[PDB]
Design a protein around this ligand. Sequence first.
Ligand SMILES: [Ca+2]
Length: 314
Amino acid sequence: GSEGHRTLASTPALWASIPCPRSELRLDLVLPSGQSFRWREQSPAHWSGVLADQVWTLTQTEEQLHCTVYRSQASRPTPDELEAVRKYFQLDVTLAQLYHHWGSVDSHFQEVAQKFQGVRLLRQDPIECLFSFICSSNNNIARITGMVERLCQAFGPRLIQLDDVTYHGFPSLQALAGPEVEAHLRKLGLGYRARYVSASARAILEEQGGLAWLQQLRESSYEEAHKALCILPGVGTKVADCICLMALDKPQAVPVEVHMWHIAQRDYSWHPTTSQAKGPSPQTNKELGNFFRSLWGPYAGWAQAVLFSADLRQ
DNA sequence: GGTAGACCTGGACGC
DNA sequence: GCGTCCAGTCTACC
Ligand SMILES: [Ca+2]
């Protein structure tokens, strides 16, 4: 009853809602789509994970986003806590308003979007984002998800336990920069990315001015930020774009990888026109990125998530 | 400046 | 059941 992960039905008094139609947000399309790797649908239609340093379970009805927190007297979320949820889902950004625009300038987007409404961008913490995506390179979303989990259990702060799941906060820079972390990460299966994590943790802390250097990018321009991020080991233009798009409030950032190339070719008959090569390459990927920005506008990154997330769904 | 290849790991095809 | 194939960054090099 008071044990295990909650359900809307099971413990009514402990939930609270946030006005939010499914047209504006589809948890099933956002939480497992490779933006964040830390949410799990423990019970059907119920997603649990760490948000704002606490564990939550989220679920929705047609017009409401129901939320619950596990902090010590169990009680429904407070308006201030719920605000953290709205901020995490950037709910002040109107999706219907963005879909309309993208749809009006791109017939193909219009066609596809009709079936995949409610795909928006989560506003993520820079550190988790940086290291989660450092783990994403040349890898599949399933292994990635396993790596990040193991990473947080071994190095992140212990939160609360539900059923047989012990939740952990994402590791701090100090923890990731620690001694023998690389060796430990290799035993956890991160492969060669084990060194990237260790090396980037130290680089940020011992050469770039620490957490402040990263946190200050949310005020810098996309061009600056993206360039700054690329210095870090394991962080290329692609990983840097994901971070810019998902953590540094750069909605125009467009991560170009295999999915996007196939979409460009199949749905837009796109070809590199100024680039040297015909296939993927540093030059062509950059060009592809510009094509989508020019096509979708300032929130091209978000538009990208709609088609991307819809691609995984096939 | 702009290519080729190697690359940890493990669920998937291919056969 | 085995070998090969896939899900970005980095580096040696022409
Ligand atoms: Ca690939």
